[PDB]
Amino acid sequence: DVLAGLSSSCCKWGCSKSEISSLC
Amino acid sequence: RAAPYGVRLCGREFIRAVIFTCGGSRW
Description:
The structure holds two protein chains of two kinds.
Chain A: H1 2-12, E1 15-16, H2 17-21
Chain B: E1 6-7, H1 12-22
Organism (chain A): Homo sapiens (Human)
Protein name (chain A): Relaxin-3 A chain
């Protein structure tokens, strides 16, 4: 999904505050 | 390790990171 989709990249590579905060 | 404002987040780390980035004590 949207979260799992980003989660995959966040875990695989990582994510910045910008990408993460945009989820709230 | 510091604040998850630009690192690898897996599952539980991802969710807590979302919270943390947005405030930490939001949910």
